[PDB]
């Protein structure tokens, strides 16, 4: 049915942590203002991604029960979700309503950022698939939390411990889906289906970055840890 006092408490807590992220407007304003070379964009991307991972560790640490997890499992969850979380966030930013013509220019600018064509079409397919769901800020925050607390992640020693942490969050998202879109009973299923399409970007991220039309692919030491790059 409708959220319990405990669920409402958990939702507002997840929301506050989620909003500690760099504002969508701060990112789209920079892209839309002027066109940049592939070298300038690759640099914008690495700084964007470094800030994202830093803010992600802080959001993750605040997830109920995360700090009670085995420390090696804590790293495995972060390493396993960081790329997925960035693309989900990029999809969110992409689908924010902007003035007439703005989202067409944003799309065109990203399309010519330096990344190869073969990664452009799968990436915009996902962004636009996410857009059709017409997700709320609360749905994005919970889906990110659910992505991080994935028990079926590689190197996870205690899967049941992660299951126990993800289950209450899945219950809240399911309820929000019945509240926000009661005319679409498939909404919760669509969102979870979208998480499988997120997993595909996780396999091609290293290639996606190294295929960028730049002479040198320089990354920060933190990005070399979460991403499989040198």
């Amino acid at each position: 049915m409708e959220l319990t006092p405990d669920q409402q408490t958990l939702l507002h807590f997840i929301m506050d942590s989620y909003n500690k992220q760099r504002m969508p407007q701060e990112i789209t304003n920079k892209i839309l203002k002027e066109a940049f070379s592939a070298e300038e964009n690759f640099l914008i991307l690495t700084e964007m991604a470094t800030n994202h991972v830093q803010v992600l560790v802080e959001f993750t640490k605040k997830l109920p029960g995360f700090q009670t997890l085995d420390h090696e499992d804590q790293i495995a969850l972060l390493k396993g979700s960081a790329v997925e979380a960035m693309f989900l966030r990029s999809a969110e930013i992409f689908n924010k309503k902007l003035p007439s013509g703005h989202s067409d220019l944003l799309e065109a600018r990203i399309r010519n950022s330096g990344i190869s064509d073969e990664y452009i079409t799968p990436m915009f397919s996902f962004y636009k698939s996410i857009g059709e769901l017409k997700m709320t800020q609360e749905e994005y925050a919970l889906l990110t939390a659910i992505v991080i607390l994935s028990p079926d992640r590689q190197y996870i020693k205690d899967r049941e411990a992660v299951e126990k942490l993800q289950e209450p969050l899945l219950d809240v998202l399911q309820k929000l889906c019945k509240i926000h879109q009661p005319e679409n009973p498939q909404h919760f299923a669509c969102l979870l289906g979208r998480l499988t399409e997120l997993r595909t970007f996780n396999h091609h991220h290293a290639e996606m970055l190294m295929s960028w039309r730049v002479n040198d692919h320089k990354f920060t030491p933190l990005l070399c840890e979460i991403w499989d790059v040198q």
């Binding site: 790293i75 390493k79 030491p221 840890e225 979460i226």
Partner: peptide, 11 residues
């Protein structure tokens, strides 16, 4: 080895 992730996780 992920000592930056480990550092960020434990303060």
């Amino acid at each position: 080895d992920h000592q930056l992730l480990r550092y960020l996780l434990d303060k």
